[PDB]
Amino acid sequence: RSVYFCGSIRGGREDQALYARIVSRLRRYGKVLTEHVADGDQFIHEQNLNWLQQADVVVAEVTQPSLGVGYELGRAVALGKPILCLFRPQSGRVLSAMIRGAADGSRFQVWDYAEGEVETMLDRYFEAYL
Amino acid sequence: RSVYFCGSIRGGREDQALYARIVSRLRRYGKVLTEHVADGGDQFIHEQNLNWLQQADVVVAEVTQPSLGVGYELGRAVALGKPILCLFRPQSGRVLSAMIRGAADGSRFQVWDYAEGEVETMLDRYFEAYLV
Ligand SMILES: CC(C)CCNc1ncnc2c1ncn2[C@@H]1O[C@H](COP(=O)(O)O)[C@@H](O)[C@H]1O
Ligand SMILES: CC(C)CCNc1ncnc2c1ncn2[C@@H]1O[C@H](COP(=O)(O)O)[C@@H](O)[C@H]1O
């Protein structure tokens, strides 16, 4: 019922519009805790960690390399959160071996998708596992 | 005694020469588990690195170039309780991730801004006086 969404901010805002589409679709399946990703660092880290601790599921869009997104994934793994990572191969980038290599059973999943299918992919995951 | 160094790879290799200098200087204070950063499959890479991280006495990360892997390593290392030094170079023109700078917490997670010419003496100082 509570969803933590990860997406690049200071790693770059190229995929901002897509993050907005992702958040909007995630709302059907839960309370999105991290709305800001779509739209004082001490405060932000604490606020977000509190949100992460209370989240039922963690969704990250991992196309744009980001320290913060990586960090949220690492903390989430260590909190035993179920994780879905969405990556876009058409971008031409190669996903971090630490994110792709983190894939493990149902608990940590990395999904490759084409941009126009992001909502359908989210529907697929939540129907199947949530 | 053993040190785990994090540096961007697939996030980009812009700062590779700085990674080489850091690894070089870290070899004065312990064995570096992750020297390859300064130069199987993703599953193997992840497991190998995670095993090294779990046994590391200290984690050092250069955090100027944004990187999923580096972030991930810092997240896993925080949960494990490993002492962390992050090195950020502001002359890059970048603003460091709020989740990295905000993670700073006493002796267990430090975030140091550095000028590129002083990076070695910064590492000397950390191991001399800022490492519990
Ligand atoms: C008061 C604000 C909304 C300030 C703006 N700053 C932020 N606010 C909320 N979450 C953030 C902020 N910066 C980074 N994050 C989190 O860290 C991730 C982005 O990391 P990055 O900035 O290193 O690329 C996102 O998934 C966010 O959840
Ligand atoms: C064909 C390649 C580019 C292979 C690189 N494969 C790798 N080998 C060893 N460690 C890695 C590798 N990729 C990521 N890492 C680790 O994760 C961090 C870099 O992640 P990044 O690729 O998301 O920037 C570094 O601190 C490394 O310790």
Q: What values do phi and psi take at A71, rounded to 5?
A: -65, -45
CATH number for the domain spanning B48: value is 3.40.50.450
* Placement of tokens 């059973």 in the chain: A105
Using a CB–CB cut-off of 8 Å, the residues of A that contact B are 8-12, 40-46, 48, 62, 65-79, 93-103
Radius of gyration of chain B, Cα coordinates, nearest whole angstrom: 13
* Structural domains in chain A (count): 1
DSSP character at residue B107: T
Ligand 2 near B60 CB (within 6 A): no
Element (H, E) at B30: none
CB of A42 within 8 A of CB of B102?
yes
Q: Given the DSSP bridges, would you call strands A57-61 and A31-32 parallel, antiparallel or unpaired?
A: unpaired
Interface test with A, best of B10, B45, B74, B99 (most A CBs within 10 A): B99
Chain breaks in chain B (C to N over 2.5 A) after: 39
How far is it, in rounded angstroms, from Cα A12 to Cα A19?
12
- Please report residues of A whose CB lies closer than 8 A to that of B14: none
Residue B87 one-letter amino acid: L
Write down the experimental method used for this entry: X-ray
Largest Cα span, chain B: 39
Query: Given in angstroms, what resolution was this structure solved at?
Result: 2.2
Closest residue to B72, CB basis, from A40, A46, A73: A73
Q: How far apart are CA B91 and CA A82, in angstroms?
A: 38
A67 CB neighbours in chain B (<8 A) are 63, 66-68, 70-71, 74, 96-97, 99-100
Cβ contact B79–A76 (<8 Å): no
Pairing of strands A83-87, A57-61: parallel
Residue nearest to atom 12 of ligand 2 (CA): A97
Q: At what angle do helices A118-129 and A16-26 cross, to 10 degrees?
A: 30
> Within 13 Å and on the Cβ side, how many CA atoms surround A124?
11
Judge whether A23 and A5 are in contact, CB under 8 Å.
Answer: yes
CB A96 within 8 A of CB A65: yes
Q: Are B26 and B38 in contact (CB under 8 A)?
A: no
Q: Which residue has the tokens 């290799």?
A: B13
- Work out the minimum CA distance from B32 to partner chain A, whole angstroms: 18
**C-alpha–C-alpha distance, residues A104 and B114, integer Å:** 37
Distances (CA, A) of B26 to A55, A115, B35, B58: 38, 42, 10, 11
Query: What are A34's two structure tokens?
Result: 């991290």
Residues of A with Cβ-Cβ distance to B36 under 8 angstroms: none
Which of A42, A72, A100 lies at the smallest CB-CB distance from B42?
A100
Count of alpha carbons within 13 angstroms of residue A43, beta-carbon side: 1
Determine the Cα–Cα distance for residues B74 and B86; give it in Å rounded to an integer.
Answer: 9
Question: What is the residue-wise DSSP string for A9-27?
Answer: STT--TTHHHHHHHHHHHT
Instruction: Identify the helix (H) or strand (E) that includes residue B55.
Output: helix B42-55
CA distance B73 to chain A (A): 7
Cα–Cα distance, A87 to B36 (Å, whole number):
25
Nearest to A11 among B41, B42, B66 (CB): B66
Give the separation between CA B128 and CA B132, rounded to whole angstroms: 10
Task: Please answer whether residues B95 and A10 qualify as being in contact, where contact means their C-beta atoms are separated by less than 8 angstroms.
Answer: yes
Which burial class, exposed, middle or buried, applies to A77 when counting CB atoms under 10 A from its CB (0-12, 13-18, 19+)?
buried
First-to-last C-alpha distance (Å) of chain A: 9
- Distance, in Å, from the CA atom of A16 to the CA atom of A8, rounded to the nearest integer, reads 8
Give the domain range for residue B19.
Answer: 1-132
For chain A, the residue count is 130
Rounded distance between C-alpha atoms, residue B88 and residue B70, angstroms: 13
* Contact status, residue B10 vs residue B65, Cβ threshold 8 Å: no
Chain B residues with CB under 8 Å of A52 CB are: none
**d(C-alpha A113, C-alpha A95), whole Å:** 13
A37 lines ligand 1 (CB under 6 A): yes
Q: Rounded distance, CA A65 to CA B65, Å?
A: 9
Q: Which residues contact A53 (CB under 8 A, 6 or more apart)?
A: A79
d(CA B130, CA A89): 42
For chain A, after which residues does the C atom lie more than 2.5 Å from the next written residue's N, i.e. where is it broken?
39
